[PDB]
Amino acid sequence: TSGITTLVGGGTGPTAGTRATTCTPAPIQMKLMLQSTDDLPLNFGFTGKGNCAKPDELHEIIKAGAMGLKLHEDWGTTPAAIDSCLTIAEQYDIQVNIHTDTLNESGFVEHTIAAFKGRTIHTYHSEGAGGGHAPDIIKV
Amino acid sequence: MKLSPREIEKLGLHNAGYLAQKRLARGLRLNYTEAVALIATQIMEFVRDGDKTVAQLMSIGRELLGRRQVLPAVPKLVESVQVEATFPDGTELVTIHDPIACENGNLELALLGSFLPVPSLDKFTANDEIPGEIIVVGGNLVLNDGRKAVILKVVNNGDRPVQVGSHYHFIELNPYLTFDRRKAYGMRLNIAAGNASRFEPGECKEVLLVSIGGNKVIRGGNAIADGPVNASNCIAAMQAVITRGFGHVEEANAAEGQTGEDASCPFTTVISREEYANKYGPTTGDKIRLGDTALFAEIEKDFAIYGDECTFGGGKVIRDGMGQSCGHPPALSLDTVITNAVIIDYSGIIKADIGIKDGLIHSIGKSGNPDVMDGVFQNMTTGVNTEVIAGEGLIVTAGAIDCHVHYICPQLVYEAVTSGITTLVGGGTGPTAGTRATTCTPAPIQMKLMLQSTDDLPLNFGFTGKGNCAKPDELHEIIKAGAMGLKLHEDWGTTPAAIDSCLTIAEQYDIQVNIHTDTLNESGFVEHTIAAFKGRTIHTYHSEGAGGGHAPDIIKVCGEKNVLPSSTNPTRPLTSNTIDEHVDMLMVCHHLDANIAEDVAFSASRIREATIAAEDILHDMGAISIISSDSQAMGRIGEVISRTWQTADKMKSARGPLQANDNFRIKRYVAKYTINPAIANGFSQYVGSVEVGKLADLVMWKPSFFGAKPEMVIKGGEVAYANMGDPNASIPTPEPVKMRPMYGALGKAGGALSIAFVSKAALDQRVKVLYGLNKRVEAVSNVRKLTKLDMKLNDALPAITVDPDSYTVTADGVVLTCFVATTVPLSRNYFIF
Amino acid sequence: MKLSPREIEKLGLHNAGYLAQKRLARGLRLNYTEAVALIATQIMEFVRDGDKTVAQLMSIGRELLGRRQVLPAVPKLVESVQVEATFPDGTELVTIHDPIACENGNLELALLGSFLPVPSLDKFTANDEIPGEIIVVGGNLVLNDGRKAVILKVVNNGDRPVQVGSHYHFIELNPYLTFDRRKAYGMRLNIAAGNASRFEPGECKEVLLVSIGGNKVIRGGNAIADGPVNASNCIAAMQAVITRGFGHVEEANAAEGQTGEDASCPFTTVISREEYANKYGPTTGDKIRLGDTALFAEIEKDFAIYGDECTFGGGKVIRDGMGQSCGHPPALSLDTVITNAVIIDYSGIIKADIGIKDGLIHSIGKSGNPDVMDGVFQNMTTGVNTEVIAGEGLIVTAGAIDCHVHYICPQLVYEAVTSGITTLVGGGTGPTAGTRATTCTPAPIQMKLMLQSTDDLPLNFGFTGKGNCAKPDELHEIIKAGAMGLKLHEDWGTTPAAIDSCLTIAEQYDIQVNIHTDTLNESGFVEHTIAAFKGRTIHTYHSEGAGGGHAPDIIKVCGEKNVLPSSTNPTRPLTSNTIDEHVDMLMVCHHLDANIAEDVAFSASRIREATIAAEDILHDMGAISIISSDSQAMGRIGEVISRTWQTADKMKSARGPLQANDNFRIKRYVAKYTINPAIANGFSQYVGSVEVGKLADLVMWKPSFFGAKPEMVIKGGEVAYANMGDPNASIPTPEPVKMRPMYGALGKAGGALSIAFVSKAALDQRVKVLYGLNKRVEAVSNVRKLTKLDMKLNDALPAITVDPDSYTVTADGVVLTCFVATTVPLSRNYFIF
Amino acid sequence: NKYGPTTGDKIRLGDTALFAEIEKDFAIYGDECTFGGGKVIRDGMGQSCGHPPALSLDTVITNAVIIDYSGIIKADIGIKDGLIHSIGKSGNPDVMDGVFQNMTTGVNTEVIAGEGLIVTAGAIDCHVHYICPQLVYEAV
Ligand code: NI
Ligand code: NI
Ligand code: NI
Ligand code: NI
Ligand code: NI
């Protein structure tokens, strides 16, 4: 109604995980959200949970139908998770969206940038009010 | 009679034996297929008689046909004959090994019960002096180089036999073998991949062990040594060896070292090179005779690391925690691996494992288990959930693509896939006058129906409309309906106006235009049709012209940069019966009269030795880029592949080499029915070559049978059609073995494994949805900017002239003349009729 | 040639005649199938000649083959030979009744036109001294006991013949028969069910009438007596008899009484007992030879009330308002009734009608019409909307369930259903190396595809994944994908670690684990594999071991309480060719060399007379619970059933009786391929026995052919496959008769009639929906708490020892030794090859 | 207040006079499953990394009070394939004691946060008149 015809993000409804992150985490939920939104006159993309230090389940969510993965601090956006997630993105040709570690728990922004390793990544709310390395995520 | 299926089939097998028996009694030397039928037939009768045991017939079967009664290739082709029959004590399998075990056989006994008079020896021809032979480089290969090694004393203190495979983690052996478990840690037997050491009870053996590779992680067996190989897990393994009573005696003195690449090091194991080829197929430097032609393919590159070959079977390499990985992420296990394949493709002749995932070729290289083997990339893992197709000793090529198909009858289709074809492109609506003359599905309705009709069949399909129109109106319609290409045929009128109107339409819709030109030169000679192309890409069918087009010089087109030219197969190559056959075939297809001056003029103007001879050469020159069938409308569906190799074989023998092997010619030719048809029709990203990311449409060949009859047709990663023997038998190989549809051809599978190709416009409308198709539908593309230079290994562009009276063809100044071959390979050795 | 289908088939029939002709000229005695082909073939040729009439060939056909030219069983098996051919006056049917009508036949004429030399009599063997024979108890049965009765004079005053069936309401007869209509009220003829009294015009007959039973409600005929039998409706019937002019003359004097169970009462009708068996099949006390074995099955219980048998046909019982009910609630009419069946099942050998409703077995008992017959319960009503399958004289058993299937080729499937198999369980993806070696469908993708592939086929299917894994990761995946069971095979590695990891997975998912053990004793001997089971249920394949497992003593497993053991069929039973065949088969499957010391050691360690002999006995002991095929990977799909009966036949002849008939052995054995496979794999509530509430997967047998070739296969209540003759003929029985798919195997029907079995996890995800299957999908269950004691009639648990050198097997102290049979039944009498 | 009540605490049902006492708690104090920035359910910590992907829960309801005929208790609830897969102490067996194999919070697991909340079965109305479709929305 405002003039939007494509939506890209993640979720499964009003759960704690979806209220915090753009993640449709289970393969089952991918199937469901694609089935759910099947009659709605908009193009849709769903993104899985990219937060992982191993590729095992990331393979699975993309095979299920995720068209992108979200790395979110609430699920942990550590340099190991960032690397593992982007290595997957290189295999499957999907975009990685990230909300960095605000707490600089694991590294400051420099350290996350290093973890990119020159690979394409979409940084969400790059200014940082919406999330990311305090106070300087904007450097991205 | 209450006939069960197996009874019905054996009656057929018997009939084939009896025919073979009739040929034998005529003193004909039998070919492979005949030898087989004859022997299986007799075995069955001897079983019916009730007098003979299985052990007897095993012997009796070697003494029916002798070297004298068979053709020169037969003793190498016939490794054995198997059949099952009902003995007095039920069904039993009889295998006759090496049935040509002597010089004279025993004619009387080969015919016994047929009531055919037994011929005398002198009725048979005199013996002449090996299809698919492997020519091995002389020498040995050292297995498993650059690895830590140890020799250990091993005793079998059990009371029963213990046998250990080449890749079993040696620490994980039966607790009754006694040796130095600590020195065995991380080790496995240094022996040829996939064999074994047998320990009878009480036996002492001295074993060469070598380190595992890759990550060096042990999984499975007894779980003695679970984990990566390191000092810390060794201590744990030893604790478990002690606690659980696994036989252990320290060998403080054991010789230790490495597998060094030098002479007489006692840790190393070598494999004789002839023997390497026999176990695992040929490697770099070896050469392979294509079928019974004179062509040799040399292995250009091998991905194998000697000693870690992927071979599946009891005690063999592809087992849990050994060659089969355990613990990698489940989603990356290959669906199927084809092991130890010789790939022949336009892009290279190599030795490689092929991994298949999701119906696609996922990877080509060295496959196996990264925990135990060096050199295994993360896209080539054989895992728990991976099926195995054994390529050792076989050739794999892409499925063939025939792009001149007349859909006259559904049985053309079975004949196609059975010869090695997996994609068909052409037009038709069944056995109508229109379809019998032209590759056209004319009405939108019929597009709908042919797509729906062929929807369960395990081939990729394209259908072409009728392009003969001097207005675009109805062309728009047939493309929007789902035609992926248009046929311009003279029988519907191929005039300059139609040619133009149809190409302008091709420019808009990105579809290929295939043409059969105005033979009659009714509205122009060839130059006028070429002018009407106006530099636009066009595919010229049977460019030589016997099958249609400007008399006598349509072949000129093989020199136009925007023309993509193909031949049809029946003129391939020029042989002794070619001209006679084609004249009469023309007389028959055109309803002409041997006794009318002008009927015979038309036909002598159409069927011309001078141009067919030129076709052999331009074909060898790479001046004609594709070979196709013309199925039942002057050509032969099952003979796209064989006629290609028969053309290559003749040219190898007539002309100069093309670049100590036949690689360059082999690759030029394989391109003619694989990659080049796919490029021309616009779907080369999906099929037409053995390359990563394309459909795993794949044909397995025995080198002894290559180019005549394949073993197995893989469609989209699953076996669609294959040689298959007696369904009731204890194994798949007993008679009658014939090409039959497999699980890929039943129910919904054909559709799940294949592609229907349409125009982009038709897809924009979702005709897949409209038409209710279960087969995947994709659009063709990238066809309006092709030139002859886009045809892989077939981009030659000679200046061609044709003498209007002599019909002599000149290319680049050189008069083209070629001899009339009296025989061809890939025929008498292979076919029962 | 413009060949119509019938022409193509007759060419085949002819070919079979000619083969039979060749065997005859060799002086072979012909079997049933041969006799048939030969005679039909000649009949067709004589028709071609144009010289002979139908009446002629009817005679000529009895004088071709004589007792001398045929095997001992043939004169009883060949009731007749039918064929149609084109005479000078078009197609005509020729039936040759009792073709063995003499001692010598007429050889010359049996071969005439074959141009085969005519053998002399002395070339034929000498006559030896009845498959499926019914041994009738001596005596008579009184029909229709305990019923009011009357004898009436009846005249035919019409000018045309009038004939009345046994169950026609006598008051409702043609108005031209004259008798006492009032005394006829509520009556019907006291004659054998399904025959008739014929009245020529003017004829006088004296008829025994008996009361109708059940509710005594009259419906149909002329509507004279519509309503329940009572004084008030009698008055109305008489009013209508008068008004409408139905012939009536009072017989004040008519003898009246009842059918009393005592000698010489003039109202009673008796049926000779031999004749009862011939009309309606055997009853309580009768015995039936299984095929040409030495087994006899005795009818244990009959639900029939003598005189009300359900027989369908002109004048017969199953007609409107008689045996066919009229007025019950429409929803409870049986979809199909199988009438007068002998049921052989593990749970009893009985005589019963079988009702089918909604694809299920609805009831087993006495069926028919409660308005007219005593003893018909409300779940056994034959109504207007009920189809009839005539079981009189036939045996019905459950469809067989083969639970060791290799999906190597789709044709295995046709061979299976055609032999009497309706459920297949195993693994595979077509003719790959992996599938040829192991019952494994390894990739989830391939599960998807095999389910979709087999979706139209009229059998129940289960598919098993590859269980060889020392980590559960990929197992979870293959089960979630739809595998209903896992195969542990040595070729993928069967190690203690894999065995454990796989059973822990079975405990979670409630699926069966089938195992082929480590033959090589690579990581343990049998005791180590047994330890690794850890008391958890497991199905051991080919438990004897010729087909795989710990050398030489895998058979020990038949004594573990948690092991469910099966045999595969080719070692069944021990016969003269067994060992020779199996050694070579092993050599062939393992690519071994007759000339290498250790290859021959491995093979002598695998194939062992001592253990195969023990397998015959443990099989008879009920120590091995199931028989399965191993289809094309050492065993034979079409021979699950026959090899079972051949094992029974041999043991009956070698060992003690098991409990004046063979009932206890018959039931023990039928259980091995019906109920026990279903229990082991977890779907025994749906199939595996003839019991109410289960799928009506049902096979009809002729006793003369039982265990070799069945008549008809019912799948889910509808005929799926069956013997069928000439499609163009005037009846279904003329040649060539062969097993062909029926309406249950076309289009969507196969799916509507069958079950695909998956794990519960796969069903929880609705893989039926995901995969687009039209076949019903159900989950397996109740498999993790089974022990050997849950195997019906096969729960024996001997202490077994095996000598490691002699291979001698001891069970419960007793050395097991068994003779090598020279012949088996269910073979030479039945098969054309 | 952080994790909802535990064994021995009592909860007033709505504004009635009814009190439910927690009869049993599966929690091991200190390892509660709470999802959020900095919180427990993050890659390699409470969210497991490396277990077989097939056994990740689709959804976990964390720290729920369950009121049900069979018992009033405190537990995590695991959902898989639309079914209740497990009830108990959920989390990551690599870093927490007491986590069984059917209670793994994995990369592909959605979180519904029940801390502080009561979970009951869906009600079942077995005297329904289908008079209008709106009854239906009013029911759910
Ligand atoms: Ni954010
Ligand atoms: Ni043409
Ligand atoms: Ni053509
Ligand atoms: Ni086996
Ligand atoms: Ni098997």
**Chosen CATH of C399-682+747-821 out of 3.50.30.50, 3.40.50.720, 3.20.20.140, 3.40.50.920:** 3.20.20.140
Q: Is B726 helix (H, G, I), strand (E, B) or coil?
A: coil
Q: Which residues of chain B are in CATH 3.20.20.140 domains? A: 399-682+747-821
**Chosen CATH of C4-124 out of 3.10.330.10, 3.30.280.10, 3.40.50.2020, 3.50.50.60:** 3.30.280.10
Contact B331 D53 (CB under 8 A): yes
Task: Tell me which residues of B are annotated as active site.
Answer: 590
Instruction: Round to whole Å and give the CA distance between B695 and B687.
Output: 6
Q: What are phi and psi of D131, to 5 degrees?
A: -90, -40
Q: Which residues of chain C are in CATH 3.30.280.10 domains? A: 4-124
Give the residue on C whose Cα is nearest the Cα of B197. C598
Please give, rounded to a whole number of angstroms, the shortest distance from the CA of B328 to a CA of chain A. Answer: 8
- Of B22, B114, B111, B54, residue with least CA distance to C23: B114
Q: What are phi and psi of A72, to 5 degrees?
A: -125, 140
Please give, rounded to a whole number of angstroms, the shortest distance from the CA of B330 to a CA of chain A. Answer: 7
CB-CB neighbours of B488 under 10 Å: 31
| Backbone breaks in chain C after residues (C–N over 2.5 Å) | 129, 659
Q: What are phi and psi of C466, to 5 degrees?
A: -95, 110
DSSP letter (8 states) at residue C652: H
Could you say which ligand is closest to the alpha carbon of residue A137? 1
Instruction: Round to whole Å and give the CA distance between B454 and B363.
Output: 30
C·D CB contacts under 8 A: 15
Cα–Cα distance list, C324 to C103, C167, C317, C367, C377 (Å): 47, 10, 8, 10, 14
Q: Is C322 helix (H, G, I), strand (E, B) or coil?
A: coil
Q: What is the DSSP string of C526-571?
A: HHHHHHHHTT--EEETTTTSTTSSSTTTGGGGGG-TTEEEEEESTT
Residue C425: which H helix or E strand, with range? strand C421-427
Which residue in C293, C746, C820, C833 has the most chain B C-beta atoms within 10 A of its own C-beta, making it the best mutation to test that interface?
C833
> Cβ distance C681 to C691 under 8 Å?
no
Contact D107 A80 (CB under 8 A): no
Contact D106 A57 (CB under 8 A): yes
Cα–Cα distance list, C825 to B4, C349, C484, C662, C828 (Å): 17, 22, 36, 16, 7
Instruction: Round to whole Å and give the CA distance between B279 and B833.
Output: 34
Which residue in A21, A24, A28 has the most chain D C-beta atoms within 10 A of its own C-beta, making it the best mutation to test that interface?
A28
CB of A56 less than 8 A from some CB of B:
yes
Residue with tokens 């009387």: B108
Residues in chain A within 8 Å Cβ distance of D49: 52-54
Put simply, the chain B residues between 321 and 340 with a CB less than 8 A from any chain A CB are: 329-332
Instruction: Round to whole Å and give the CA distance between C475 and B672.
Output: 44
- Of B139, B168, B137, B138, residue with least CA distance to B154: B168
Pairing of strands D118-119, D59-66: parallel
Counted residue by residue, chain A has a size of 140
Sign of CA dihedral C115, C120, C125, C131: positive
Please give, rounded to a whole number of angstroms, the shortest distance from the CA of B486 to a CA of chain C. Answer: 34
For domain C133-143+269-398+694-746, is the CATH number 3.40.50.300? no
Instruction: Round to whole Å and give the CA distance between C754 and C457.
Output: 8
Residues in chain D within 8 Å Cβ distance of C476: 52, 54-55
Instruction: Round to whole Å and give the CA distance between C457 and B747.
Output: 8
Token pair recorded at residue A136: 């300087």
Instruction: Round to whole Å and give the CA distance between C612 and C610.
Output: 6
> Cβ distance C322 to C168 under 8 Å?
yes
Token pair recorded at residue C353: 């009608």
Ligand 3 center from residue B819 Cα (angstroms): 27
Task: Tell me which residues of C are annotated as active site.
Answer: 590
Ligand 4 center from residue B315 Cα (angstroms): 14
Please give, rounded to a whole number of angstroms, the shortest distance from the CA of B824 to a CA of chain D. Answer: 58
Cα–Cα distance list, D76 to A12, D29, D92, D116 (Å): 19, 13, 13, 12
Contact A63 B331 (CB under 8 A): yes
> Cβ distance D84 to D102 under 8 Å?
no
Give the residue on B whose Cα is nearest the Cα of C481. B385
> Cβ distance B747 to C410 under 8 Å?
no
Token pair recorded at residue B124: 């048979």
Instruction: Round to whole Å and give the CA distance between B622 and B659.
Output: 13
Instruction: Round to whole Å and give the CA distance between C257 and C261.
Output: 12
- Of C736, C810, C782, C779, residue with least CA distance to C39: C736
Ligand 2 center from residue B677 Cα (angstroms): 16
CB-CB neighbours of C132 under 10 Å: 22
Instruction: Round to whole Å and give the CA distance between C698 and B602.
Output: 67
Give the residue on D whose Cα is nearest the Cα of B326. D52
Q: Which residues of chain C are in CATH 2.10.150.10 domains? A: 147-259
Strands (E), B203-347: 204-211, 217-218, 227-228, 256-258, 270-272, 287-289, 296-298, 336-345
Header resolution in angstroms? 2.2
Q: What share of chain C is helix, strand, coil (3-state, %, to 5)?
A: 30, 25, 45
Which of A12, A57, A59 lies closest to D56 in CB terms? A57
Ligand 3 center from residue B429 Cα (angstroms): 14
Q: What are phi and psi of C84, to 5 degrees?
A: -115, 145
Residue with tokens 């130890």: B340
Residues in chain B within 8 Å Cβ distance of C33: 1-3, 7
For domain C147-259, is the CATH number 2.10.150.10? yes
Beta bridge partners of B486: B465, B513
Provide the H-helix boundaries in chain D.
134-139
Interface of C with D (CB under 8 A): 471-473, 476-477, 480, 761, 764-765
Interface of D with B (CB under 8 A): 52-54
Instruction: Round to whole Å and give the CA distance between A91 and A97.
Output: 16
Q: Is C627 helix (H, G, I), strand (E, B) or coil?
A: strand
Residue B751: which H helix or E strand, with range? helix B749-752
Instruction: Compute the C-alpha angle C143/C144/C146, nearest 5°.
Output: 125
Q: What are phi and psi of C363, to 5 degrees?
A: -175, 160
Domain membership of residue D111 as a residue range: 1-121
Strands (E), B76-147: 80-87, 90-97, 134-135, 140-142
Ligand 3 center from residue B437 Cα (angstroms): 6
Instruction: Round to whole Å and give the CA distance between C826 and B4.
Output: 14
CB of B655 less than 8 A from some CB of C:
no
Q: CB-based contacts of C5: which residues, under 8 Å, 6+ apart? A: C727, C728
* Ramachandran region, residue C385 (left: φ > 0; alpha: ψ -120 to 50; beta: rest): alpha
Residues in chain A within 8 Å Cβ distance of D38: 103, 105
Contact D59 A56 (CB under 8 A): no
Token pair recorded at residue C637: 């799909």
Contact D52 B329 (CB under 8 A): no
Which residue in C77, C479, C523 has the most chain B C-beta atoms within 10 A of its own C-beta, making it the best mutation to test that interface?
C523
B501, amino acid identity = S
- Of C640, C584, C573, C630, residue with least CA distance to C607: C584
CB of C740 less than 8 A from some CB of B:
no
Q: What is the 3-state secondary structure (H, E, C) of C224-245?
A: CCCEECCHHHHHHHHHHHHHHC
CB of B79 less than 8 A from some CB of C:
no
Instruction: Round to whole Å and give the CA distance between C378 and C236.
Output: 29
- Of A55, C492, C119, C135, residue with least CA distance to B331: A55
CB-CB neighbours of B779 under 10 Å: 17
Q: What is the DSSP string of A65-118?
A: T-SEEEEEGGG---HHHHHHHHHHHHHHT-EEEEE--TT-SS--HHHHHHHH-S
Question: Cα C122 vs. chain centroid, distance in angstroms?
Answer: 40
Contact B384 C478 (CB under 8 A): yes
Contact D82 A28 (CB under 8 A): yes
CB of C444 less than 8 A from some CB of B:
yes
Instruction: Round to whole Å and give the CA distance between B391 and B161.
Output: 31
Contact B329 A59 (CB under 8 A): yes
Sign of CA dihedral D89, D95, D100, D105: positive
CB of A63 less than 8 A from some CB of B:
yes
Instruction: Round to whole Å and give the CA distance between C32 and C76.
Output: 9
Contact C764 D53 (CB under 8 A): no
Question: Cα C258 vs. chain centroid, distance in angstroms?
Answer: 41
Contact A18 D50 (CB under 8 A): no
Burial B448-459 (b: 16+ CB within 10 A, else e): bebbeebbbbbb
Could you say which ligand is closest to the alpha carbon of residue A125? 1
Q: CB-based contacts of C760: which residues, under 8 Å, 6+ apart? A: C509, C510, C779, C780, C781
- The chains found to touch D (3+ Cβ pairs under 8 angstroms) are A, B, C
Residues in chain A within 8 Å Cβ distance of D113: 15-16
Ligand 1 center from residue A125 Cα (angstroms): 7
B·D CB contacts under 8 A: 5
Q: CB-based contacts of C353: which residues, under 8 Å, 6+ apart? A: C303, C310, C337, C338, C339, C340, C341, C364, C365, C366, C367, C368, C380, C391
Residue with tokens 């006056």: C89
Contact C824 B90 (CB under 8 A): yes
Cα–Cα distance list, B710 to B398, B642, B702, B704 (Å): 12, 11, 7, 10
Could you say which ligand is closest to the alpha carbon of residue C405? 5
Ligand 5 center from residue C590 Cα (angstroms): 14
> Cβ distance C832 to B11 under 8 Å?
yes
